[PDB]
Design a protein around this ligand. Sequence first.
Ligand SMILES: *[C@@H]1O[C@H](CO)[C@@H](O)[C@H](O)[C@H]1NC(C)=O
Lengths: 49, 49
Amino acid sequence: YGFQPTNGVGYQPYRVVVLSFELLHAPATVCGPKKSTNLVKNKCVNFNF
Amino acid sequence: GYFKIYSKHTPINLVRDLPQGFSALEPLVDLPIGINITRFQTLLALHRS
Ligand SMILES: *[C@@H]1O[C@H](CO)[C@@H](O)[C@H](O)[C@H]1NC(C)=O
């Protein structure tokens, strides 16, 4: 590619990243995130620890 | 796929014989490898000086 700055769109360089999630047969690995809330002590309030 | 390691460091009042007594071992590490294992060895520091 001889890229030049005065090229019409569709001839200018694009950078590409291809993420490929694979699942072999291990026990686990990476994963999404998990925010953390607060803790209100003294009050029958549902909880997850 | 997890390789667990428990350990304990007790002080003997001997040098190199297996003593008697009770001492429970506390978990140290956890490695999500996936590795298969069938054999193992040891490593020693030679005599040169
Ligand atoms: C470990 O070796 C056994 C051999 O019987 C094989 O079937 C198994 O797939 C191996 N473990 C993994 C995680 O591939």
